[PDB]
Structure formats: C-alpha cells, structure tokens
Amino acid sequence: RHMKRMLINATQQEELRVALVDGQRLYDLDIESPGHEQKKANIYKGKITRIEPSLEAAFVDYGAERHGFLPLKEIAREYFPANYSAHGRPNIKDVLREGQEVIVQIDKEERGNKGAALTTFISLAGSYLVLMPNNPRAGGISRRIEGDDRTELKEALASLELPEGMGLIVRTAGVGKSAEALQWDLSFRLKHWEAIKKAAESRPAPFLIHQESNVIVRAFRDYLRQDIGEILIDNPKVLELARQHIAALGRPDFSSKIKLYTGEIPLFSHYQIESQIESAFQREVRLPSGGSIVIDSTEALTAIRINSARATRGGDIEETAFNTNLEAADEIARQLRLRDLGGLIVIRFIDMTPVRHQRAVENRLREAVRQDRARIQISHISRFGLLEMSRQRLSPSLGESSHHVCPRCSGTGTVRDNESLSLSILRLIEEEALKENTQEVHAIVPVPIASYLLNEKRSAVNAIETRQDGVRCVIVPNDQMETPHYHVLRVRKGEETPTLSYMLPKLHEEAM
Amino acid sequence: HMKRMLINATQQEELRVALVDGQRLYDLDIESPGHEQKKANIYKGKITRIEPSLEAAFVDYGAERHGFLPLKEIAREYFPANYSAHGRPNIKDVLREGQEVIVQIDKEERGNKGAALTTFISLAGSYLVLMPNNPRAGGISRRIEGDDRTELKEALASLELPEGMGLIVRTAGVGKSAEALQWDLSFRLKHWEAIKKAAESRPAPFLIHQESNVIVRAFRDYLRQDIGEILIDNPKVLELARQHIAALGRPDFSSKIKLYTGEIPLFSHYQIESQIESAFQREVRLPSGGSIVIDSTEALTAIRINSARATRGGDIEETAFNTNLEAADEIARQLRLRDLGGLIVIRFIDMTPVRHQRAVENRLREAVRQDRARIQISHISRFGLLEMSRQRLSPSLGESSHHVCPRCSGTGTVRDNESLSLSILRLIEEEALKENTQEVHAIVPVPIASYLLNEKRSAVNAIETRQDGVRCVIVPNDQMETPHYHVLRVRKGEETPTLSYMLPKLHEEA
Ligand SMILES: [Mg+2]
Ligand SMILES: [Mg+2]
Ligand SMILES: [Zn+2]
C-alpha cells in the first residue's frame, strides 16, 4: 500500500535507525549509536543534597554523579516555603532545605568535571513554539520575525488560551502560522507538561522524566501526527519503551498505531528503503534526469554542486538548467535530512539568466524544506551564483558519527604529486645537510619517492654529498608509508650510529 | 628594503619564480616544463602566394604550412602607396608576392589547414592590450561595469597613447592606479619599438616574439615598476633572461639581471623556503596565534578562520576583529601564491558591529589590489560568510601538483568500520533469505571480518540458525582496503569443499 509510516530498526544494539517513509519514498532518517550521550534539555526529578549559601546555589542529586549545580536565580516560586520575607531573597538557607525534591532540567552539560548546571525553569520546545510553564516573565516572539508578520503573528499569539503563570515564545519557524495552528502545537506541549508532573508525583527519588537526546522521543515529538498510518518496530524490548515514551510525551492516543514487525525479511529491505539509505552515504547522488549533485564537507561549511547530464541532441540549455535545478532542490532538501547535516550549507545552482527562473528554484527549495523539523534559514541566489543556507545541528551528522578522517590525505581530498613532493624532500634534506655539525641525514619515505629520488634525481643527491662534504645522505624505502608522508631526521657528529640503511625505520619508528 | 625576483632553475622540471620584499614572499609561479603553444607569436614572413578567390594570401612565417592572412586583416600600412579605394578592394591590388610583413598568429593549425594570421598586432600586458595597427580598436572589457568602469575610463583617458594606436583595458586592470597603467603602457610601447627594429634588422622569415614562453610570461606577469634585481641561479636561464628583456625593449635593465653563486640554495639564502611550503599546507598560522584553513571542493573553495589558542582576557570583541584583519591579509597573499581561481568563500569570526564588518571587507579589498587578477568581493552576509570571485589565469597549484587521494576518492573521510560491517551484514541476510540459496560468501577487509565475527558473532549465528540449512562464510582479505567488499551467493547443489581462506582465489579467478 501507500501510507505514511514510521519504521524503527533496533536489532543491532550498535545502531538504532528511525526511518520515516511516505508511501515507498524515504523522507527522513535518524541514527543513534550508544555511548557518548548528550544530556542537554533532559528533565528529571532530584533531591537536594548540599545547601551552600556562599555560592548562592545547591548541589542536587538527580541520578548522575556529581550532583549538579542549581543557582537561586533559577528557582521558581513554587519551591519557596509558605510565605517569604524579602531581605534581598539571597540566602539559600531561607528558600529550600536539604532532602527536598524538585523537578530539574539541564541548562549546561557539563563543562569541565564540575556538576551540570541546572534550572527549575523548564523549557519545552517545538516546531512553532517554546512553552516555559514555570516562568511568566519570559515570553516573546523570535527576533527573526518582522514586517506585518509580527503584527499578524503577535495578533494570532495573544488569541490563545494560555494558562496563567506560564509564558511562551514563538519561534523562527512560526511566521504565517494560523491562530488555531498555534493551539495545535500548544496542546502538544502542555499535554507534555501534565505528563511530566504526573510522572513527578508518581514516585519519589531521582529519575529520568524526559530524555531530549533520544532518537525515538525526538522522532515522536517532531513527526508523530495522525497521517502516520503505522509505527512498525522490530525489536520488542524497544517497542516496550516506545510505549513508555509516548505515555511520557502525554499522547497515549497514538500508542495504538505502534504495531510490531515479525516478518523474516529485514524491515527496511521489505519496505524497500534500503537502497535510499545508501544514497545518504554517497557523494555524487544522481538525479532523476541524469543530473547529479555532489556534497562535500569542509572545516566549517558544506558545499553542494549541480551538474547536468551530457547534452543530448542539441536541446534547450535554459529549460535543462532550470529543470535540473528544480530536481536538485528536491534532493538537496531530502539529503539534508538523511545526513542530519548541520551548519552553513552552500549551493551552486546552474546559472540561469532570468529572474523568473531563479525565484522558481528558491521557491521549490523553501517548499521542499518546509516540513523539515530543524530550523532552516535561506538567502537568495547571489551575484556569484551561490545560495547560502543554515540548518540547526540538533544531532550528529553521518560524517561525525559514521565516518572518520582519511588516514592518507588527513582531511583534504588530495595527495601532493610524486615528483612535486620528492623535490620538496630533496631540498628539505639539503636544508639539513647544510647546517654545521651534521654527520648524517636520514629520510624515510614511500617506496616510489625513494625510487624517484635515487634514480631520476640520483645526480642531485650526489651533488649534496659533495657540496657539504662528509655528510652521508640516506634515503630509505618503506612498505609502511604512502605518498603524502615522510620523515627527515638529522644526525650530529659523534651521534653517528653504524646502522644499516634498511634497519633505520625500525630504529626510528620510536622517534618517530 | 628592495623588491626582488628570484628564479630557481637548478632542477630540470621545476622553474620556481618568487618575489620578495626584503625577505617577505608575496608572489610565486611554479612552472613545470613542456607544453609550448604558438598562438599570439609574432613572426616576420615573406608573402608567398596571393589568391583572390579566397580574398586571402599566404605567408611563410617559417613553419611548414604557410599561414593564411585575409584581406580583412591587413593594416593599411602594407597597402601600396599609390592606392585608390574604388569600392571594397580585391587583394591583387594590395599585396604582392615577396612582400615582407609583420604577422601574428590568431588561430593555430587545424589539421591540414595552416595558421590564420593578422597584421593587426596586439601586445597584451598584465593590465592593457596595446594595438599599434588599428586605432579603430579600443575601449574597455565588457566584464567591467559600474563605478569600476567609470574609474577606468578616467585613468584610461589619462594615458599618453600615440596617434595611430589603440588600447583595450583588461579585466585584471580594474583596481590599478594611473601610474601602473601608465607604466604597463610604456612597456608595451618600448616592446613595439624593438619589434619594428628587429623586423628591419633582418630580412627573412623569422620569429620576433614568443608569447607563450616561460620567461616572457614571468616578466609580463611579475616584472613590475619597482623590481630592483632579478637574481637567477642558472647561467643558461640568465643568458635567456637577458635576451628576452632586450627584445621587450627594456634593453638597459639587462644589467640588473644578476647571477647567484652560493652553496646555500637561493630561496634558502633569502630564507623564503618555509613560506613557499605554506602554499601547500592546508592550515596556515597567523601572526597573532590564529589560523586559516583552506579546503577545495568540486565547485568552490572554502576558508575558515580560527582565533588565538586562548584569550587571556575577555575583550573578546578586539581579539575577533584583529584575527579577522590578519586573515584578510594572509588570504589575499595565499590567493596569489597558489594562483587559486573560481569561487572562494570565507567564514570570518563573527563580529557584532557592522562598522567592523566593513572594516574587514575593506582591508581585504585593498589587499587584492596588488593582485594581477580581478577579484570581486561581496559583503559579509547574514550568515557571516563573505563570498568572493577570483580570475583563472592558470590552473592552480593544487591543480597541477596534486592528484586525488585514493583511499577515499576525494571525500576526506572513509566510512567507519562499525557502520560498514552492519551494512554488509544486512546484504548477507538478504542473499541468505532466498529460495535458490545454500551458502553465502562475504569477502571483506581484514578488520571488517575481525568485527563481524567477534562483536557481531552472535548476529551471524542468528542468521544461520534462522535460515535453516544455509552457511555464511566471512573471509578476511589482506588485498582489500577500508571501503571495498564482495557478497556472493551459491545456488543449491553447486558447492566445493573449497576451504574458506582459499575461497578468495576461487571467486577472484572467477
Ligand atoms: Mg534526519
Ligand atoms: Mg601560472
Ligand atoms: Zn583521503
């Protein structure tokens, strides 16, 4: 059939995968490996253990060690005694006791080894709006919004049955939103809040109430709407928790959609999204019409390039550039989700002379990324032909978590040419043979550099041995070295070792 | 402090040309040998045939195939003195067999055709193209619009350009002062005198100017008003250097072109060698403890800036705005040293004041002024990124002297071993589900099998105890690296007792 489904794959404890499919076409992928958890925005219930009116704070045990550091400015009124006497409100001894119990969120994990900074002022974020149910002060509309939008937005913002004593924030992605579309994302949030408290009195101790980092909860909260037919799961220990979670987000209606999968064929291959999860791992993703896009990664940005197909019987180059650039706005948008790419992205669309064809593509792109859960901001095609854009780094991308740095080229895509580099070494040797008190000079190098430096540049090496006389210049071949790597060590008179040339790598792997 | 040109022609495959203010490097070309080209070469050539049918003429410039000079391309100076235009002319009347002419090559040889010629000579410098033979030519490039095109048409019309001549101002000239343009012009002129002197000094077919030559290109592209000496470290080159500077009509400079006789090689005497190695580093240190990080890409080039190792104090607003002015300077240089072309993208440190953002854009626009290549520059945008474009004069440094890493094919990354086992491990579970099937064979890199058969041991057993009567063999292979693999299947009936370590050579041989 054709249906919006959510597929979860939890067989290998090494990787939990959450695909979201629309029919038979994969829309978004999410991946968790265990360890190395980011416990930011997590909510617990914990016990005060150490009052300290000198730091104006209180260590709190929540079930991790060390306690975690809670300042007084971050304490809501509900945790003060019956009545309060304002003498500045500054002493902790006057606000709370040891062994009290409090609901707590992480505001800074966990810089240093010091406990993690905490706040009783809880923030529950969404696609549209951030509900802080503990704090009437804080409330606003995102800075990015302006124009008639702010007036329209702030006129659809007050129209809301928002409980008295909570305060909420509208988000970048909230513009244009309808007056009852914003109560749709607000019921989601304060249903959560009732469940966070339900599970707060539920039991006493320190325990985890909301786990912001977790793939499923993140994927339940952002994508679980009623056009999702099923939520197929293949590991029953995971389906148990998948229910405990949706209980916790306060939405136990949808719990019914959570079927289980027992079929023999591995779940993703049955539903035939396994090929498309592998185009996540490519570089050159072919497009439906023989075009291609090409995704590169650099220190602090990410760059895509569009290529058309090889020109075919003299067609129209402008309706080909246009048609390819539309197809690539679709795919760049999908690929941003499959890779969980985060930071500034930059795109080189094919050039098109009309302003009507550029706005067509920038639109096709705003649309394609509209339902993208993460914040996305876009600019317009520039003087040079580049579109800049940004995407919120929630999670680690496939590069950070399923890839590592190339051993040979050390990041770059390249290795210096052999001759180019050989010469670089030839002078780097001489540079060290023309110092004073230099008995020998050793140069461990890839087998083809050694080969080049001692046949085609043999005369140049010999030339160094005669100019600065007495200086033995030893160039070693090595099985354990490829084209970008070399060592060039110097030896001092009296430091001479009667060592063989082929034994010098074993003697110097120490050095190294 | 004197600005010098160092040439380094000791090694047979690498002429290295550097430019140094004192011992500060600021330019460089690393030209490999071979690959000569004839276009734009200037010859003296006897006319040899005349063929009205084509409204042309043929010229023996001294190549095997005579060249093809059309009527459309004949300066009026070669016309017979007694000449009456009575309509567009036929060429009988204009040229005679045996006439000597100064010719330039404007298309090379196209199979069995011979090179098209012109007597409308053009002498391109870095910034200008003098044209001593048509005053009808002129004006400015069409890729300069704006207050950049009017700032030219002024410094252009303040140049002392003789009667009969013409002058195209080039793209690379945008930012240049009237004094550099006035200096480039006076060198195209002196060159045009030499040419006429040499064409009169010897009646012939010979070669007068070799536009493509490694030495000529180095004087055009870096021999500039304020260059004090040219220190060369090969007698042979030095004798060529002097011949070319005499034929460029600066025959008096020939004496500044000194030799170098040292045991310490030249660039290491001026202690520049470490700065030339900076041009192949991916990261470059900055004076005040920062860094820049240049990374190439299919379509553009991408620079990141990083601030000092640490900030002792918290005037974080004056450590950011300084590291970013250093970066303008070192990028501008570093663009020159690598001859980087195409689109570049810079990610400066974020500064909150727009007055600081224009400060940087301005430093950078001033520093790419002494570059011979036109460099347009945008504004630090809403996302902190300054876009900018530089002109392709040459394939770049990492284009000529670099190739594509083989581990990853350009990526920068290889897939982790846990991510890639689990993929293989699903493709085994596919093949092994089939009806046809009896065994299934994976041939995988040594550490992948180490992973599948140890951490994922139980998961392979499960693939076997389920699919009842199917074997899963995972064989390590020395011969096979970080990314590659094979997953092969065996229909029921056709096995061999072929052991598991001899199973690579079986299937390999198949
Ligand atoms: Mg995703
Ligand atoms: Mg060059
Ligand atoms: Zn590599």
Numbering used by the authors:
A (entry chain A): -1 to 510
B (entry chain B): 0 to 509
What did the publication describing this PDB structure actually write?
Ribonuclease E (RNase E) is a metal-dependent hydrolytic enzyme that cleaves polymeric ribonucleic acid internally and serves as a central element in RNA metabolism of diverse bacteria. The NTD of RNase E (1–529) is highly conserved and harbors the catalytic activity of the enzyme. RNase E forms a tetramer in which the protomers are arranged as a dimer of dimers and accommodate an RNA substrate at the active site formed by the interface of two subunits of the principal dimer unit. The catalytic site is located in a DNase I-like domain, where conserved acidic groups D303 and D346 coordinate the magnesium ions that assist in the hydrolytic attack of single-stranded RNA.
In an effort to structurally characterize the mechanism of 5′ end sensing by RNase E and its interaction with sRNA, the catalytically inactive RNase E (1–529) D303R, D346R was purified and used in co-crystallization trials with sRNA bearing a 5′ monophosphate. The oligoribonucleotide comprises the MicC seed region connected through a tetranucleotide loop with a fragment of the ompD target encompassing the seed complementary sequence and the RNase E cleavage site (Pfeiffer et al., 2009). Crystals of the protein:RNA complex were obtained, and an X-ray diffraction dataset was collected to 3.0 Å resolution. An RNA fragment of 2 to 3 bases could be modeled with a good fit to the density at each of the two independent 5′ sensor domains in the crystallographic asymmetric unit. Given that the 5′ sensor domain is known to bind the 5′ end of RNA substrates, the RNA density was modeled as the 5′ end of MicC. The 5′ monophosphate is bound in the 5′ sensing pocket, and the RNA forms additional contacts with RNase E that were not seen in the previous structure of the “closed” state, where the substrate is bound at the active site. For example, the phosphate backbone is engaged in hydrogen bonding interactions with R373 and R142 in addition to R169 and T170 identified earlier as the core of the 5′ sensing pocket (Callaghan et al., 2005). R141 also contacts the RNA backbone and supports the second base from the 5′ end. Analysis of the crystal structure of E. coli RNase E co-crystallized with the sRNA MicC identified a potential metal ion bound in the RNase H domain not observed in the previous RNase E structures. The coordinating residues at this site are D26, D28, and from the DNase I domain, D338 and R371.
